[PDB]
Symmetry: D3
C-alpha cells in the first residue's frame, strides 16, 4: 500500500480515495485500466514502456467512447508525480479510468465525464516467489476467452476480467499456478493475466491478437528483444496440444514479467526447468535495468 493516490489531478491520501457505491463501474464493468512497472535501475527509478501503456489506456477508453480529459503526456506526468510523492524507487502502477457516479442504467448520460485514478505501490512476482527462477505449473482451462466482436479483447477493460477470474481461479483450485485459456475456436489464446509463448526448434511462437489475446506490451517487447537476439519469431495460431510438444513454454506480462512454464496439465515441458531460449530472453529483459541490455527503443522513462 502507499500514502497517496492521484485522483482527478489531486494527490489524495490513500484512505480518502473513495467513490460512491452507485458508481457506474461497480455495476457495469465500465472502466479501463493498465498495469505498469517502475524499476530501480542503473539509471534510477524508471517506468517501463510508460508511453506505450498510457497510449493503450487511451485506446481502451476510445473503443468504449469513455471521455478522457487527460492527455497521454499529462497522464505520464501524473504517474511520475504519484511515484515520487510516495517516495518509491520500484513499484507497480495502476492507472484506472472509470465511469463514476452518473446514475443507474448501462448507458451513461450525454455529457458525462470519467474519473481517473493512478495508484502506485510495491508488488512482488505475480506468480510466486520461485516463479521467475524455477517456472510454474500451468493448466489448460475449461473456460474460453471472449469471442471476436463481443467484448473487444484488444482493450484492457474491467469487465473483461470476469473471464480471467474463472480461468485463473480454476487453475489455482486444481493446484496449478496459472490457467491458460483457449479461444472459442479451440486454439491457444493467453493466460488469465499473461500472454503465452512457445519455443520449438529454436523458434519463438505466440498467438496473434485475433486469437482473443491481449496485445501485451511485455509480449511486444519480447518479440523485439528476440529479433535483436537473432531469434526467429512467428505470430501464429497455435493448437492446444502444441503446449505438450513445445521445447519450452513461458508467460509474459507486466506483473508476471517473464515466467517459465515447466509443465502443462501435468505434462513436463522439456527438462522441467527454465528453457535455454526463455533464459536468453529473460536475461535480455532484466538486463534493460542493469544497463547490460542497451535500451535501443527508448523503453525506460525516467521518474526522476
Amino acid at each position: 500500500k502507499a500514502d497517496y493516490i492521484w485522483f482527478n489531478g489531486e494527490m489524495v491520501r490513500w484512505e480518502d480515495a473513495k467513490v460512491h457505491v452507485m458508481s457506474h463501474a461497480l455495476h457495469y464493468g465500465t472502466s479501463v485500466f493498465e498495469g505498469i512497472r517502475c524499476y530501480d535501475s542503473h539509471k534510477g527509478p524508471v517506468v517501463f514502456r510508460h508511453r506505450e501503456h498510457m497510449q493503450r489506456l487511451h485506446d481502451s477508453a476510445k473503443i468504449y467512447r469513455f471521455p478522457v480529459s487527460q492527455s497521454i503526456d499529462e497522464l505520464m506526468e501524473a504517474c511520475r508525480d504519484v511515484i515520487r510523492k510516495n517516495n518509491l524507487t520500484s513499484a507497480y502502477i495502476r492507472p484506472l479510468i472509470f465511469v463514476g457516479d452518473v446514475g443507474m442504467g448501462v448507458n451513461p448520460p450525454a455529457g458525462y465525464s470519467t474519473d481517473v485514478i493512478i495508484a502506485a505501490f510495491p508488488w512482488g512476482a505475480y506468480l510466486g516467489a520461485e516463479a521467475l527462477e524455477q517456472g510454474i505449473d500451468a493448466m489448460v482451462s475449461s473456460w474460453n476467452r471472449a469471442a471476436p466482436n463481443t467484448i473487444p479483447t484488444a482493450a484492457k477493460a474491467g469487465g473483461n476480467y470476469l473471464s480471467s477470474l474463472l480461468v485463473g481461479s480454476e487453475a489455482r483450485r486444481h493446484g496449478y499456478q496459472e490457467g491458460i485459456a483457449l479461444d472459442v475456436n479451440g486454439y491457444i489464446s493467453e493466460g488469465a493475466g499473461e500472454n503465452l509463448f512457445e519455443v520449438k526448434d529454436g523458434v519463438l511462437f505466440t498467438p496473434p491478437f485475433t486469437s482473443s489475446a491481449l496485445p501485451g506490451i511485455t509480449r511486444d517487447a519480447i518479440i523485439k528483444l528476440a529479433k535483436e537476439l537473432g531469434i526467429e519469431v512467428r505470430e501464429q495460431v497455435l493448437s492446444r496440444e502444441s503446449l505438450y510438444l513445445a521445447d519450452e513454454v513461458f508467460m509474459s506480462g507486466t506483473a508476471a514479467e517473464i515466467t517459465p512454464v515447466r509443465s502443462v496439465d501435468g505434462i513436463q515441458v522439456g527438462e522441467g526447468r527454465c528453457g535455454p531460449v526463455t533464459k536468453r530472453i529473460q536475461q535480455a529483459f532484466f538486463g534493460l535495468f542493469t544497463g547490460e541490455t542497451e535500451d535501443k527503443w527508448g523503453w525506460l522513462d525516467q521518474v526522476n
Copy 2:
C-alpha cells in the same frame, strides 16, 4: 435518489455509502447485481417476484464463487427494510454484491468476503415516457453477445455490461431507442437490457438462454401469463430476419417492463403500433398491480 442505502446490514445515509477506489469490482468487473421493482398496488407497496430476484442474485454469485454471507430471506428482509426506510411506495431496487477492497490481482485472496449494497429509488420507464404506450424503434447491433462458455450469460454480473454498453450506445447514436443483439451464431439473442419476444400468427416466440440471452424474470412471468391467457409459447432460436416478418415485436425487463417495438432497422412492424397480443400481455401484466389479474403464482411480496 434517496436518503438511505442498506450496506452490509447497516442503513447508511446515501452520501456515506462509499468504497475505496481500489475495490476489486471497479477494476475487474467482479460484482453481481439485480434489478427489482416495487409497485404501488391495490395491496399497497409490493416487490415484484422478490424471491426470484434474490435467488438469481445468489445464483450469479455462486457461478463466480463469490462468498455471500446473507441468506435469501435476509436479503429480502433488507430489501423491504430499505424501501420502508426511504418511505417509498414505488421504486426500483438495486441489490449489488461485489468484491471490495481486498488487494489487486484478479484472483481475490482466500478467505475474502464480499460487500453487499441494496439501494432503492424511484425510476421511470427504461426506454422513455412514451415507450410503453407507443412502442420504440429498435436496431440490430453490429456487436454480438458473449459466446457460450466465455462469461456466463445466465449470470447477471457487472462485467457483462461492457457488451450492453456497446450494443445500447450504438443504437442510441444512430437515432434508435434500443439495440437488439445477435449471438455469435447470427441468431437473435436479446436487447441490451431486455429480453426479446416476437408474435407471429397468434403464437409467442422468444429465444432460449442458449442464444446468449439472460433468463429474464419478466420474460418468465410473460411466458406464464401467456399460458394463462391461452397463448401458445415457443422458446426457440430465431433468425435475424424473423424480426421483419413478425406480426408484433416487444421487449421485456424489470426496468423496461413490457415495451412494444414498432420498428426494427427502420422497417415497420405490423401497423407500427402496439400489437394486439402485446397489448393483452401488457394489460395482464399491469393488471397484477390493480387486482385485475389474479396473482396465482405469488409474485407480489408485501413490503409493509
Copy 3:
C-alpha cells in the same frame, strides 16, 4: 414456354418479354421470386396456397427493401389472368420481382422502382417422371448452405441460388438426382430446391428455419396435414447421419411436390421405396385436388 407473360401490368407475348442486359438483377442477384402450381381439380383449375406465395414474395422484397407497387390482391389477379390468357388449367407459375435498368453500382438510386414478371407454363415433376412414384437417390453435398445473418435464407431471392446450383449440380454430376446440403454447423439444412423431412418411429421430423432452410409453403402444408392425420411432428435440428437411420425420408416443394428419397449417399432408406407415412401424407396432399381431402385451410384458389 407459353404464349403470354404478364409484364408490369400488361400481357406481352412470350418472345417479346425481354430486358436490357444492364438490368440490376443480372449483375447483382437483386430479385425475389416464387414458385406456384395451378392444379386441375374437382373445382376446376385451382392455384395451391396462392395468397401465401404472394405474401412470401412480398416478404422477400421487404427484407431487401425492394419497392413493390403491386398489392397482394393485384398480384393474385394477374397470376390468375396469365393462367387463363395462356389457356392453362394446370401449370407452374413463376412471379419475379427484380431491380431493372437503373444504373450500375450495387445500391440502386433513391426512388427506383422494380419490374415484375409472372410467367405460367406446364412443368413436369421437378425430379423426374418416376420421382413421386418410385423415389429418388439423394446425396449430401460438399457445399454448405448460407450462414445465418449473411444473406437471409427466409427469403426466396435470386442471388441465393448460386448455392443451390453448386449443391444440385454436384449431386447430379456424381450420379444422383438431388443434393441435400448441411448448414455451416454441420446439420441437415435442405435440398438444393426443396425442404427435407425424415420419419422415425411414426414421428415426422424437419429442420427449423434457423438451420438455413427456406420456410417452404409445401413444408408448412405437410406439417398441417400431418397433424390432421394424427401424426406427431417435430421441427428440430437433425444430424447428418440421421439420414442413414431414418425409417423414411422425403423432399417437399412446389415443383417437387412430395418426392420420396429411397437412398442417401448410396445407403438405402427403409425398404428402398416410398415409406408408409410418406404415402399417407402424399395421398392426403393430392387428395386436395380430388376432394377426397377436405380443404379445411382454404388452400385452393379457383382460377375460374
Copy 4:
C-alpha cells in the same frame, strides 16, 4: 450509357442489348462479372490490369462451371473495341458472363452456353466527388460476409451481391458513405465493394482471402506498390476494434480506387484526413497514369 455494347461476339447498339426475362441469371443470380477502368494517361487511354481482370472473370466462371467460349485475348480485344467504338479515353468497363434463356430450374441443361456482354461508360468516384481527397466516413455493418464453403467469395458472381446490398445500404441509410463487413467469425472482411487496408506504426495490413474477402486486383496492386516503396505489408486476420486503433484506414477497388477512411463508426481515424502512408500509396498509384510511377509490372494495356 454509351452507344455500343459488345454482345456475344458482335458490337450491337446499346438499345438492342437485351435478353429474355426468363434468362437464368435473372432468377438465380447465375452470372460472373468484372469491373475495369480505362484511364487517360501520359500514353493515352490505358486499361488497368486488363488481363488480370479477364483472368479473374474466367476463374469466376470456372468455379461455377459456366462455359466460356471466348479466350482471354478475345475478351481483351472486345473490351478495347467497346472503349474505342464509344470514343472514350477514360471509363468504367463491365464484362458480364451469364446463364441466359436456357429454361427454368436452378440446374441448367447439359450443353448450354453463356451469354457474354461488355459495356463501357464514364463512371466517377465510387464513394463521392470528395472521397479520394478528403476520405469518407465508414460504418461496420450488422450483416456478415458469406461463410467459407457456402458461396465462394473468391469469385465475383452476381448472387454474391445481395450481401453487398445489405451491407452497403445499411451504412448509407445511417448517414455513412460505405459499410465494412465482418466475416462469420467476427473479423474484418472487406467493404461492400472494396477491400480494407489499415496502417499501423508504418506497416500496411489487410485481411487474407480466407477472411471472406474478394482477391481484389487493386488490393494486389497496392501490396506490390507498397513493397516497391519499402513499406512492410502483412496479410493477416484483423479484429473489428483494430479499425479504431489503426493510424490510417483506407479502401481499395476498381471503382473506388484508393479512398481514405477518415472515421469508422463515428470514431476519428488519426487526424481525420488522409494519412501519410495512404498518401504515398495513392500518389504511387495515380503516378502510373502520368509516368511518374514506372509501370514495372505491365499493368497498362494501351487502348490505341
Copy 5:
C-alpha cells in the same frame, strides 16, 4: 474374464479369442461396439433393452458401411448364449464388430468382411461402489466433444473413444469421478461414458443428439419412465452454467445405470445428495428388475 466368448458364429474359449496384430481396427479405430447389462430379476436373468442395443450396433456399422453378416436375432441369440454358457445371471455384455486382418491402408479392400465378438462378464458400478447411492463429483472437461459431420457421434465406434479417454482421464487426474464434456459450441454434451440429465423446478432436462451426445438407450428409457411418472421432459441445448443452477444432476448409461451427481467443479448440487426426482427415476428404473415397475415396453429379454 469368463470362460467362453462368442467369436464369428462359434463359442470359443476366452484364451482362444485372438486376432492378428495387423487387424484394421487396431490401427484405424475401425470398430463399432455396444454395452449391455444382464440383470438378475424377479424373473431370473434378463437382458435390458437387448434388441435396442443390437439395433444400434447395426446402425453404427451401417453408418461406416461395415458389412454385418449376422441378423439382429442371431446376435441376440449369441448374446443369450454367451451369458448361459458362462453361467452368469448378472453381467455386462460387450458385442464388438470390427474390420480385421484385411491389409494395411485406411480403406479396406472391396468385398471384405468384419469379425464379430461377444464377451460377457460381471461388471460392477461404473463410477464406484458408492456411486448409485451417494452420487459422484463431476468436472467439466477442457476437451470438447467431436463436432457435427466429422466423426458421427450417433454411432458407438471405437475411434470415438480417444475423446472419451481425454475427457475421463482429466477428471480422474484432478480427483473427480467423471468428466462432463461440452460440444464445440460451448454447450453441455455428455459425460465421457454417460448421458447428462438436469432437474430444474420439477422438469427433467437433457441435451439433444445434435449436442454431440450419444443416443443413449438408458437415456431414452429414462425419458419414457419419466413421462410415465408424470414428469415433464425437455430435450434441449443446455448451457455450461446450468450445471451449477440445476436442482438435481445425474448421469445415465448401461455401465453407470443412473448415477446422481452431487457436485460439479466443486460446486454442490442441491443438498449434495441424491435429489427427489433422481430418486423417483432411479427407483422406477431398478423397479423393473423386481416387478415393482411394470415392463410396459418389453425392455426385459429373458435369458432362460
Copy 6:
C-alpha cells in the same frame, strides 16, 4: 506381408503375431502409429527420416499419456532389425503402440503398460501404379476433419482414422482416387492420408497444423527442399475454391510420397499433368536416394 514382426522386443513369425480380442485398442481406438519407408539407395538400404518418425510416435503417445517403455534409439534399432530379419532392402514400416488386454472401460488401470509392434513389408505407391507419374483425380469430401481441441490432430492415433475412412471411401465410391477434407471452418485441411500442397505463381502453399492437418514429415521435408530450390513457401489457410485456381496441386505422405493431383472435383488443374514445380520438388526428393540431391539434413538412416 513378410516372415517376421517385432513384438515387444522379440521377432515373432508373422502368422503368430496376434492379440486378444479384448485388447483396449480394438474397442477404444487407443493406439498411436507411424508410417516409415526404407529405400534402396547408393548407400544401400536407408530409412527416410527415421528418428523424426519415432519421435512423432513418442509425441503421439505423450499426448494421450500412453506409457512407452522403449526409448527412441531402441525403437530405431528394432525397426532396422525387422527390416533385416525379413531380408528387405526397400519397404514400408508400421510401428504400432497400443493399449492391450488391460480390461474394459475407456480409462486403463493405473500402472498399465502398452504393447508395441513393428511390421515391415513391401508396399507399392499408396494411390496407384501410375499415381506418382501421371497424377490423380481428387474430390473434396462432404465429411469434415476433427475440430480443434476434440481429438488432437497433431497426433497419429488409431481412433483418428474413422474420419479418414469416411473421407477416403467417399472419394473412392464416387470414382476418384483420393479425398481432400475441409476443416470445421470450411478451409482446406488435408487428404484422408496425406497433406495437401498448392502451387500458384511459382509459390508453394500448404495449410498450417491449425487447419486440422497432420504435421506430415514428408510435408516438412518438401518445405525444406523447396527452400533449397529457392522456392518461396507459405504455410497459410487456404480456401476450398483455391483448389480450382491453383497452377498445380499435389499430395505428400510417407506412403503416397509426392503424388500430383491432375484434377479436383472434375476440374482440371493446370495442363492436367504433373506441373513443373511439383516436378522440381519430386526429382529433388527421389534424388536423395541416388545422391543427386545432397542429404544436407541427415535424413537417410542406413539399415546396414
